[PDB]
Amino acid sequence: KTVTAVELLVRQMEAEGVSYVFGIPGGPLMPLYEAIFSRKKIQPILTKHEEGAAFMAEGYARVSGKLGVCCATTGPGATNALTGIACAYSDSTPVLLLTAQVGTAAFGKGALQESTVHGVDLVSIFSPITKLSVMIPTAEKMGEMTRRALRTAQSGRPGPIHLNIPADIAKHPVPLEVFPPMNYRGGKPAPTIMDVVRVAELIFHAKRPAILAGHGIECAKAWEELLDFAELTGIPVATTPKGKSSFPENHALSLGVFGFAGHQKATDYLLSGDVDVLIVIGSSLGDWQTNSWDPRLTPSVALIQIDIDPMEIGKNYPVDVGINADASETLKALILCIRSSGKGIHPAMVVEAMQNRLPADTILFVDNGSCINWGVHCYLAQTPGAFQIGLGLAAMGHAVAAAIGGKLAAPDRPVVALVGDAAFAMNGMEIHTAAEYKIPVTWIVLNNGGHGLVHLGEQHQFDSKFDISSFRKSIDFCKMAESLGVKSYRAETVEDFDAALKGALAMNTPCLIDVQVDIDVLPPGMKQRFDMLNKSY
Amino acid sequence: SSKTVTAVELLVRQMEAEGVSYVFGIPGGPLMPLYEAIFSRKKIQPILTKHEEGAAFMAEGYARVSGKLGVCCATTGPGATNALTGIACAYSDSTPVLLLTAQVGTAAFGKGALQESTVHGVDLVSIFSPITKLSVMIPTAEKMGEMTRRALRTAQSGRPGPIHLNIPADIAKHPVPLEVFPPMNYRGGKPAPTIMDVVRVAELIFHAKRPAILAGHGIECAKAWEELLDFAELTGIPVATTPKGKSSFPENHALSLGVFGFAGHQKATDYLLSGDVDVLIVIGSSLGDWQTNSWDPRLTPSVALIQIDIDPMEIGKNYPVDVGINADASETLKALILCIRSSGKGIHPAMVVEAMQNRLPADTILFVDNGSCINWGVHCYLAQTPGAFQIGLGLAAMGHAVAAAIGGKLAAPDRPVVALVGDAAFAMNGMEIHTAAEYKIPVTWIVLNNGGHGLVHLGEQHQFDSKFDISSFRKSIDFCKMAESLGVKSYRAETVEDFDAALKGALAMNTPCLIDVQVDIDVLPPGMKQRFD
Ligand SMILES: Nc1ncnc2c1ncn2[C@@H]1O[C@H](COP(=O)(O)OP(=O)(O)O)[C@@H](O)[C@H]1O
Ligand SMILES: Nc1ncnc2c1ncn2[C@@H]1O[C@H](COP(=O)(O)OP(=O)(O)O)[C@@H](O)[C@H]1O
Ligand SMILES: Cc1ncc(C[n+]2csc(CCOP(=O)(O)OP(=O)(O)O)c2C)c(N)n1
Ligand SMILES: Cc1ncc(C[n+]2csc(CCOP(=O)(O)OP(=O)(O)O)c2C)c(N)n1
Ligand SMILES: O=C(O)C(=O)Cc1ccc(O)cc1
Ligand SMILES: O=C(O)C(=O)Cc1ccc(O)cc1
Ligand SMILES: [Mg+2]
Ligand SMILES: [Mg+2]
Is residue B510 part of a domain? Predict the structure, then answer.
């Protein structure tokens, strides 16, 4: 039994549990769509921009805990996706990007949108921000290369893949051989028994232990192991900003967010100098995770760092126990050992009204801009994985589009995106996509008529000497939503906002809420933060 | 002991000496010192766009219309990666565009800096290396001047192309000696043909029984329009253009064969593929797919193929040459003229284009996006004015013209600028019309609204027997309401009378305007039928 190479690719994605392929067609890509529509299993989602498709696949992957897939044509289709894939790379999200390539017979002749070394070399452009970027050389190799891509994306530190597919091989016949995922990728690494024993001993004798949980908790699906571990030991848990929702913030052991826009309670605990044993789980300990590598984060007695990526361990802080292992496998081992032992509207008011009306199981997507500060600082995240923020690359527009992918991954749950107006101008056209497929997402646009953080930067770092941040005329997002077939509310009082949010939650359609916001409002942690840029200059 | 300026102010001053007038982009923390220097100097004006891709497109459109360097800027990480498609288009169209990007401070390298853009994070220099002539990080403030001059010389020498300069945020404000140079001091002139090649070409022309010229986009790059015209008139040799080279030759001229290749004209096809052309002169064309009807062997002439190109790597690539001239097209045409003289010897889209032809002033610059608008514009619009037809066909990126048109208007503020674009392309970059509203840049967008991806829809019918639809929107976008949302006046046109009145209204306005034209998605555009094969 034979199938086209591209159908084999689609069938192998089927066995990984892939449900959607986000993208925009093109001539050389049409065999992929022909295969998808023939199989009636994976559903294609047409987006407005391939960057939006990459964002959506990234949002789908993070919420589903599965592989996200997007596709793009030769040349400018693929290059349009790059920012989204770079975000996936920075956030360790498994996203597979399928791109088309011209036929082999046209290499080096000036083919339309030629995407080889002789034209626009997509394989090379994507190499720095993917775990693997490769062109399928022959139809016979489609199988091996697809399994390689799927194994690479989801093994070790997860990350995106770029697979480039020449249009002439795509429909060549190949043996129909699909494998279950267990047969072509391996399991997760665990800690050694001696490392488990040594950590348990450090915990038993510690007089002021603490946990810093990062985004690796989501990557590892380690939420309930982390919660059980903390309750079993009494150890309080802080999270990184991106790590928000790894631990329930209404829990008695929750310190809140440590770092940028974080909570005084976490800062006091971890920088006091009193913590003797600090356990870092799944954080790369970059700038915003550490208040620019504050030396006071160093504990008194031992720093324990657990990471699946051995290159992150001991990078910025010397470690006393450095565990290279999956976070959930490490926490399980620790639990077992310890147990068997026996031993306009102010944005803060906006967030507050959201907290009072949003169901507990709401998945909140937050963009990049002042909404980082307001969401990270002012929103209480009780549900595991329910706070979705892209802080690895912090690309404007990420949350605007990724929330659509998130809703497709969790159709039973409310999905809300908190975004700025300039971010919405970058990728807000995608709400037309939500309208087209009736994907109920609510966008809350903090409409401050320009680039808030930039505006505040001009005031605090540049003496208000110039303005490259304020629009001379704010965008009317309700009219824009109307033009794209999405219901809208304008909110200028918190009462109007609450009525809009309550209408939007009930409606079963996409909806947009245009919130009037003062561009001069100083968001939490921003004041304390400008100095790093000043220090940099 | 001489006066010093910040490294970033040196960069601005050196750009001033190249005649740069605008910098298109979006600010970011690490990029702020560049904006401080620009506003300090009060000469180059910054243009805040909606998306960094829009900034790269506008720089490309500005460069192509001005004949000068276009400049855009983006912050670390995702600001820069958002510009990439526009820079890739400049690379494919041989357009000199300088992209300035920020980098984190060097003290943070390898530590997980915010939007870290090094080998340890998102490696901008590597990402951009394939689609720039030069991609480089300024290592030290002291190197700012040499690296900036190197970028400007690289962008505008040989075959023009884009440049990526990455600037660490700490370097940007370090003092450097105030050393600025005129462009002639750090880049050279253009290459000319040898006397022997000129004489051989003149001889081949004198003896040819059916000569022909195929003029490509290199004519615009070389600013060679008058020399081409005078050469054609002196010799009586008819001129076809490539699709992208459209407007390199006046199409109302008795010697014009029109466009050869994709969406081209039968008169050109008959003339060049008949088999009777004995001497073919190719000037500034890469002879890619659409330029040659997929490398049709019949294009080969009977007696001699003469190819003139500034890039030696293009000569003889797809067709064997008899005279391969590595030189600038303008210097080559001037030498040939001198030698020969001294010798002594909904609405149907065709009705939309027709109505445009009947109303656009003669000096209008027409930007055409990528989609079925390619076929309608290349085939049905008669371009009489040198360089007034702007289509990005090197990469043919959807949305290119939507944003590029704004750059073109800043480059030619006294001429009418009109963009012919599809609805899906406008969904991709149409937010930039807000930039035109903010800066009061009068461009007219003509959106061919057929409710989805027309070319893809036609490919489904003609190549996949209509087995699936991944092209038709369930609901059309309302571009009048969208334009209104962005503060741009708009018209909806369902009859050619509505369209004519709307175009007349847009032209008189002198503010930006959008015309939302109802178009049938089933219409087969010219030359598409002969394609899909
Ligand atoms: N399954 C896993 N188990 C443990 N650590 C992981 C796992 N998956 C990813 N990681 C690690 O988690 C870290 C996440 O870092 P990052 O995305 O910067 O988040 P944060 O902002 O919370 O530091 C990376 O060091 C990565 O190696
Ligand atoms: N000043 C110049 N003189 C001659 N040729 C040039 C000049 N500038 C660029 N070129 C050449 O013109 C060609 C343009 O090719 P391309 O952009 O593919 O347009 P077309 O679609 O008309 O072939 C390239 O071969 C390039 O080397
Ligand atoms: C693609 C991209 N370009 C630029 C930046 C730099 N940047 C960070 S915040 C900001 C302003 C965001 O404005 P808006 O979305 O309106 O948010 P606000 O700060 O006004 O709430 C910019 C440009 C970025 N993060 N991503
Ligand atoms: C960025 C990008 N993505 C995809 C393509 C492939 N492509 C070529 S034409 C086309 C459809 C264009 O639709 P629209 O702008 O509405 O024009 P129409 O064909 O309907 O007139 C697409 C997707 C492209 N050229 N550029
Ligand atoms: O954090 C960043 O890099 C931003 O993009 C926001 C910003 C912009 C300008 C400033 O002067 C300070 C901060
Ligand atoms: O020309 C291209 O490559 C396109 O992207 C438009 C297109 C899309 C699908 C087809 O089946 C044929 C043409
Ligand atoms: Mg804003
Ligand atoms: Mg269309």
Answer: yes
